[PDB]
Design an enzyme around this catalytic site. Structure first.
Site, PDB file in Angstrom:
ATOM      1  N   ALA A  86    -139.247 -34.666  13.506  1.00 44.18           N
ATOM      2  CA  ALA A  86    -140.461 -35.148  14.166  1.00 44.18           C
ATOM      3  C   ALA A  86    -141.480 -34.036  14.425  1.00 44.18           C
ATOM      4  O   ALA A  86    -141.160 -32.837  14.367  1.00 44.18           O
ATOM      5  CB  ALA A  86    -140.104 -35.860  15.478  1.00 44.18           C
ATOM      6  N   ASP A  87    -142.717 -34.443  14.681  1.00 44.48           N
ATOM      7  CA  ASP A  87    -143.792 -33.502  14.977  1.00 44.48           C
ATOM      8  C   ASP A  87    -144.776 -34.104  15.962  1.00 44.48           C
ATOM      9  O   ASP A  87    -145.067 -35.295  15.895  1.00 44.48           O
ATOM     10  CB  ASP A  87    -144.537 -33.111  13.724  1.00 44.48           C
ATOM     11  CG  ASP A  87    -145.305 -31.826  13.897  1.00 44.48           C
ATOM     12  OD1 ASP A  87    -144.679 -30.803  14.229  1.00 44.48           O
ATOM     13  OD2 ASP A  87    -146.527 -31.838  13.690  1.00 44.48           O
TER      14      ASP A  87
END
EC number: 3.6.1.9
Lengths: 208, 204
Positions: A86-87
């Protein structure tokens, strides 16, 4: 929403973040960390491009993280299972806010957020056990900060909490004192939106 | 200037205790004595609105906490209480009585928007009850399915929570969106609580 029977007891988590680890534990997912090797330059994947909108940016970066994580898994020789990345980006007026470089920077970021809404966007991607990238999901949230006062924000900066945080605050810490409301996903704001993550994990046949 | 290094939290809830610690506030507890029927404080009145209910119960909790402090012989300091209810279609949803009740609640919330209302009150160190505050949030559940709600009840997470779910647990899987305060939904709205605590001169 039809959930197929799970085949995988353990998920590979390609994240060093304690928040993302905690949020996976919150929904009962077992995981094994799969972190960038010494010879990998993990920071390089996170460079923005010019005129690139924030939603485009975080999606692009998340896809690259996912591809690097899967390649990491193949080279390890470890057994096949889904891999997650994720980011997260924090933006106001389209400008991406990073981590303050000192007290005065932290103060200046917070005074910029003060009395306004800003957006926190997190994208999550899962590559399934056979190596197929599933559609990445983007969580869009807004966060409203009180105007409060300069002294109130100085007092917060003096706790030291702003350092290492994007936008100079942490929703799960003392900054909650300034947050009047949010709209979207608290888990998303923290770096792993659980509604969308759970959905990808059911699709990838992870048991939880 | 802050004058008090610590306050009393009159709550048995692990969630309220964790949330208070999150904002850096030191606290002792004022828990009900064994022979204190703490449950009866939370009885609804017939035809009472959710809003009025949570407010009223929170004032009652504050006054019972005042009497606890007095009975304990412990020193003066601020006292904090809160109460939370879940409402949909005008109805009040409390903590489920059993697994069947938990499933009936979740079935009623599925595929819909509901509201979570948490009232918070502080008595300052002088003994003055400050005006209570109210945190209103809305929560949207996905449709999901009966089967998926049955499995969730099976984990035991519904028990002890208004409306038969715990936002900071597996229920996050069917929560599509919230608007308001995640800490308020959990039982201690940190924005409103912090403001009362600053007014009451608690250091944090």
């Amino acid at each position: 929403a039809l959930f197929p029977t799970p085949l995988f007891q353990t998920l590979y988590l390609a994240s060093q973040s304690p928040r993302r680890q905690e949020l996976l534990q919150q929904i009962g997912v077992r995981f094994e960390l799969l972190l960038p090797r010494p010879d990998e330059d993990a920071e390089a994947l996170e460079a923005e491009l010019p005129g690139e909108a924030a939603d485009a940016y975080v999606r692009r970066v998340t896809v690259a993280k996912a591809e690097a994580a899967r390649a990491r898994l193949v080279a390890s020789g470890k057994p096949a299972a889904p891999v997650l990345v994720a980011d997260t980006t924090v933006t106001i007026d389209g400008a991406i806010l990073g981590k303050p470089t000192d007290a005065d920077d932290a103060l200046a970021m917070l005074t910029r957020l003060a009395g306004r809404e800003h957006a926190v966007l997190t994208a999550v991607a899962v590559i399934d056990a056979s190596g197929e990238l599933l559609p990445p999901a983007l969580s869009r949230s807004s966060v409203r900060f009180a105007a409060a006062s300069r002294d109130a924000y100085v007092r917060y900066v003096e706790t030291g909490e702003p350092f290492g945080k994007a936008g100079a605050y942490a929703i799960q810490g003392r900054a909650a004192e300034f947050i009047e409301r949010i709209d979207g996903s608290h888990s998303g704001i923290m770096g792993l939106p659980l509604f969308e993550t759970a959905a990808l994990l059911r699709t990838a046949r992870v048991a939880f």
